[PDB]
């Protein structure tokens, strides 16, 4: 039957970007015309395909990755980008073929007392490969001498919180992001639109 897009888009709780969620999708009909929820700042850009007549193609599988980032960082979720999120949290392949859909969620993920639940990775020695997920919380060793799980000089916790308050600028307001990746191999196409 229908693909569980509302399961991942209209979902109540989203993930921290370093622990970005992945929802494999197969064996269903995909209606893309409903992904426009008319949220405040709706972003919908695709690579390798046109958003229109998208219910016209079929794919072997479709991956729905979801997370929350800061409003400025939505630019980093794109092929061939460097930065905070692209290097160490979520890396798109240079030949990415799919769509990126993001929207402002200041009304959901911001509390006046400040929301520190969402996290992102600050410290990492090397860039992420595309679609890598690093969930390690080992203390970052920035010095010559080992940390042994203790924060301090030359020894930092690798993650930092986002600090979402409603009155912050739009750049720093929370944004909910779903990246749909279209996989097509020499196998039956299990994800289709109408026709």
């Amino acid at each position, epitope marked *: 039957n229908l693909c569980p897009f509302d399961e991942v888009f209209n979902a109540t709780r989203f993930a921290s970007v370093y622990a970005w969620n992945r929802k494999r999708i197969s064996n269903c009909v995909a209606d893309y015309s409903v992904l426009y929820n008319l949220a405040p700042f709706f972003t919908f850009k695709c690579y390798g395909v046109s958003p229109t007549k998208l219910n016209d193609l079929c794919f072997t599988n479709v991956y729905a990755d979801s997370f929350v980032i800061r409003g400025d960082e939505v630019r980093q979720i794109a092929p061939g980008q460097t930065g905070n999120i692209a290097d*160490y949290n979520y890396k798109l392949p240079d030949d990415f073929t799919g769509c990126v859909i993001a929207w402002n969620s200041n009304k959901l993920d911001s509390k006046v007392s400040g929301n520190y639940n969402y996290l992102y990775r600050l410290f990492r020695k090397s*860039n992420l490969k595309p679609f890598e997920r690093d969930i390690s919380t080992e203390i970052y060793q*920035a010095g010559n001498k080992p940390c042994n799980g203790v924060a301090g000089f030359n020894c930092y916790f690798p993650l930092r919180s986002y600090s979402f308050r409603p009155t912050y600028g739009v750049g*720093h307001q929370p944004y909910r992001v779903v990246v749909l990746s279209f996989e097509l191999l020499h196998a039956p196409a299990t994800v289709c639109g109408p026709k």
Partner: antibody
Amino acid sequence: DEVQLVESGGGLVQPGGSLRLSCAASGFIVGWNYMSWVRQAPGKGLEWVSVIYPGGSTYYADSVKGRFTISRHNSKNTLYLQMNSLRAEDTAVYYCAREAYGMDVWGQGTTVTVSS
Amino acid sequence: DDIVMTQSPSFLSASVGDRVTITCRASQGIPSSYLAWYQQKPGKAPKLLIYAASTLQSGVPSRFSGSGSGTEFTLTISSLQPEDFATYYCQQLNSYPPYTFGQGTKLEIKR
């Protein structure tokens, strides 16, 4: 391992010249840290010039775009700022700094004067 | 446009033993973790006083203290010492450059 940054390479050049500042660190490892170049013009404030991430990515101020290149030699544990097409407004004391919880390790500074 | 930090006052004269507050105002609301306060004396490099707008850097005397959130953050010396007469810059270290500084506040002697 007394932590410090020691800087060198600054000096006097006419406009359009090149100059490669270096910043040798002890106490931490430059390839593993966020390293920043910050300049301060005489009688003025502090201005961020450039930064290199541990993962490799480099960012520059709009003023130095296309003219300055930040880099590092891991074996010598040294940061570098190469300055090309130099201009009089780049005249400043240049510091290197390590940034984890604010910039906590600051170099001495080396002086760049660019004048015809 | 950009994220601009404005320090009030530019110049401020106090006496030894006085309580002093310097205010740093941001153009738009920012996470409090971004702020750092720096102290600089003539001819010497800046020294990190406070980061996260409230967390005290190690080795800094307890009289220094920072506070704030949103667009207004302050740094305070409880009892101003003779060695404290210097210039203080406020800073924001955010997730994507540029890192912006305030214009600095010069702390001079009251006579």
